[PDB]
């Protein structure tokens, strides 16, 4: 089928550099013209930067202009990105998407890749800090409890939390990671009804493999 | 390098109607305008070209209208594997460039956000920061309005919030935000408020 496998994001520090590349395969990657685009979450879409079926041309967004290069192996089916003096900004995830070939001269992406991301942060890798969320006996909405795992500042993304796995008040609610100034902070709670608390236990399973493991409540 | 406008960033929508999402190119950009839908995965498709072009596989469901810097999508029948976001882009002249997005949400009734406070605890204290967390619990639509009161006082810049995005059952959102201080911040104040303006009552809560 049409494909595109994106490899080598990863942590980079500002200064630094980084290579992805793009595996084609379903497609005579020798007729079409490769592109990379961005989504820097926050920010959208951006067009980073084209080669041409066998690159004799190519286009830079003014903003990766003179650090990045785009390149490819036709017999190796390979698109590649080589990226220098890495920004903060250029923490993206990376699509490679091919053009399109058919409108004369209209630029569009009819397939692509499922993303490498790359994040620039001088942050060093760090397993989080876990701190229990607590209810209050036959808690906060008369009938029903509420408690929480705090998973706060950890580096990279991501934390994976669990809890319950079973039936029945399984209401768990990871809210989306928040960057503090540096580092990364989530919360799980679920919501099970006040006659659970003090008659049984939940514990709340973090873990992060830039190391830490930590199950707790 | 048009600047590309979606004027709407999320339509409250219902399955089985009729979406019209639209984009305006600063320049024309004489009918190279394409369209895309990103899954709520990431993962991004290509719908339309050329305007109205339809790309193989993509249902007749989708239609692309346009005049020159006015462009449209429009879903005749919404179907539940059409919630996602929906961007533009003109692919004339370098750099090409995208909207912003028109991203899909589920129409349903008013729901209000049963709201818990959650006080830090030992550990962190012992480390110094207070986290105190307010959560605002399965409500529709998504906008609520916390504000955190330290002693009456009016918090401006230490909360940050998260949002649950719609839930793939029953359709509503969760949020929390989280007031980080210090431990001498902490404790030079003793009453901590969350104070929540939701169209669940014309009431806040706390």
């Known amino acids: 089928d049409v494909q595109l496998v994106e490899s080598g994001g990863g942590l980079v520090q500002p200064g630094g550099s980084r290579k992805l590349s793009c595996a084609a395969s379903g497609f005579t990657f020798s007729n079409f013209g490769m592109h990379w685009v961005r989504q820097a979450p926050e920010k959208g879409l951006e067009w980073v930067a084209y080669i041409s079926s066998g690159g004799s041309s190519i286009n830079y967004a003014d903003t990766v202009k003179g650090r990045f290069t785009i390149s490819r192996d036709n017999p190796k089916n390979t698109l590649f990105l080589q990226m220098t003096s890495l920004r903060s900004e250029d923490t993206a995830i990376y699509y490679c998407t091919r053009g399109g070939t058919g409108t004369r001269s209209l630029y569009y992406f009819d397939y692509w890749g499922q993303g490498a991301t790359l994040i620039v942060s001088s942050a060093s890798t760090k397993g989080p800090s876990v701190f229990p969320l607590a209810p209050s006996s036959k808690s906060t909405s008369g009938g029903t409890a509420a408690l929480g795992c705090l998973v706060k500042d950890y580096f990279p993304e991501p934390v994976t939390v669990s809890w319950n796995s079973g039936a029945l008040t399984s209401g768990v609610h990871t809210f989306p990671a928040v960057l503090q100034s540096g580092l990364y902070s989530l919360s799980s709670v679920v919501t099970v009804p006040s006659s659970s608390l003090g008659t049984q236990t939940y514990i709340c399973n973090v873990n992060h493999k830039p190391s830490n493991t930590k199950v707790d409540k | ?206």
């Open chain 2, 1 to 206: 390098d048009i600047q590309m406008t979606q004027i709407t960033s999320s339509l409250s929508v219902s399955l089985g109607d009729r979406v019209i999402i639209s984009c305006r190119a600063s320049q024309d950009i004489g009918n190279f305008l394409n369209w895309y839908q990103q899954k709520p995965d990431g993962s991004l498709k290509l719908l339309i070209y050329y305007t109205s072009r339809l790309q193989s596989g993509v249902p007749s469901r989708f239609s692309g209208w346009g005049s020159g810097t006015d462009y449209s999508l429009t879903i005749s029948n919404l179907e539940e594997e059409d919630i996602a976001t929906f961007f533009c882009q003109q692919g004339k002249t370098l750099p090409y460039t995208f909207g912003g997005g028109t991203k899909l949400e589920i129409k349903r009734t008013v729901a209000a956000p049963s709201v818990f406070i959650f006080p830090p605890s030992d550990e962190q204290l012992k480390s110094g920061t207070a986290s105190v967390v307010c959560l605002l619990n399965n409500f529709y639509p998504r906008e609520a309005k916390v504000q955190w009161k330290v002693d009456n006082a009016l918090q401006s810049g230490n909360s940050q919030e998260s949002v649950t995005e719609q839930d793939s059952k029953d359709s509503t959102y969760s949020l929390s935000s989280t007031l980080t201080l210090s431990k001498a911040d902490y404790e030079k104040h003793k009453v901590y408020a969350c104070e929540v303006t939701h169209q669940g009552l014309s009431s806040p809560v706390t």
